[PDB]
């Protein structure tokens, strides 16, 4: 806020009820900003595709049961959110977040044993 546009002072969560509000607050800001993110970096994907990525990022950490670890993830989310909504990231940075735009594909690991073996460890 005061230092720069989307700056959030680093604070610990008081309890699990406090943490959950921040996590939902963080998700709400992210998926709300998805229309702006598309037109601001000229992303060649629909807001639906972008918003799915937001949920998966939040779902990788759905099973965390440690309060200190949540505070770390919340601070990372605020830092990524600020550097996105401020035009500090470049199209290369945001585009790299979408795993489909790598010339070797998104399925960058072998499907099963025999496809990886026939190609040579993937």
């Amino acid at each position: 806020v005061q230092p720069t546009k989307f700056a959030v002072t680093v604070r610990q969560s008081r309890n699990w009820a406090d943490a959950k509000q921040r996590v939902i607050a963080a998700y709400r800001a992210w998926i709300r900003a998805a229309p702006e993110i598309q037109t601001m970096y000229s992303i060649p994907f629909p807001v639906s595709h972008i918003r799915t990525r937001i949920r998966q990022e939040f779902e990788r950490h759905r099973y965390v049961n440690k309060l200190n670890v949540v505070d770390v993830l919340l601070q990372q989310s605020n830092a990524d959110f600020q550097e996105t909504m401020n035009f500090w990231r470049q199209q290369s940075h945001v585009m790299a977040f979408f795993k489909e735009e790598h010339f070797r594909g998104e399925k960058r690991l072998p499907s099963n044993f025999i496809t990886g073996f026939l190609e040579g460890r993937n």
Binding site: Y63, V64, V69, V72, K99, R108, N112, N122
Partner: protein, 154 residues
């Protein structure tokens, strides 16, 4: 599923053709263990690869034991991507970003604790210890009641 490789793990931007398929990625729900590998920013690959935890043996070429004092953490070399010959200069290219990295620990519980916290697969190699036997200079000149059995030359 009892050491089954999770062919559906999400990839990150450092996932390459040389990255092995992991068994167990941290989710932040493990009991009693800080999930550093979840928040470190390190690629998924480091939870798929195995580190070796060992005391380096004394070199056979020297008597100094300075480098055997500490515990070493080292990454095993993969089948593909560790080295290949660059066609232009004949230099040795690598795809293994861990090839020149090692970690030093005062005790192996420390090394194990760091490895569990990051989510590395690890293998602990215990150090072979010398078997003590007293040595005496005067044993070079023991009286032989019988056939000499060996002729000593100082």
């Amino acid at each position: 599923p009892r050491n089954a490789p999770d062919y559906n793990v999400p990839i990150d931007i450092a996932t390459s053709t040389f990255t092995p398929v992991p068994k167990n990625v941290q989710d932040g729900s493990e009991e009693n263990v800080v999930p550093a590998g979840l928040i470190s920013g390190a690629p998924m690959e480091l939870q798929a690869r195995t580190v070796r935890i060992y005391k380096p043996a004394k070199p056979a070429t020297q008597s100094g034991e300075k480098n055997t004092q500490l515990w070493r953490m080292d990454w095993d070399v993969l089948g593909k991507g560790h080295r290949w010959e660059n066609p232009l200069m004949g230099w040795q290219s690598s795809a293994d970003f861990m090839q020149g990295t090692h970690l030093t620990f005062k005790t192996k519980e420390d090394a194990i604790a760091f490895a569990e916290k990051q989510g590395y697969e690890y293998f602990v190699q215990e150090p072979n210890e010398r078997h003590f036997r007293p040595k005496a200079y005067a044993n070079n000149f023991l009286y032989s009641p019988g056939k000499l059995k060996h002729i000593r030359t100082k």
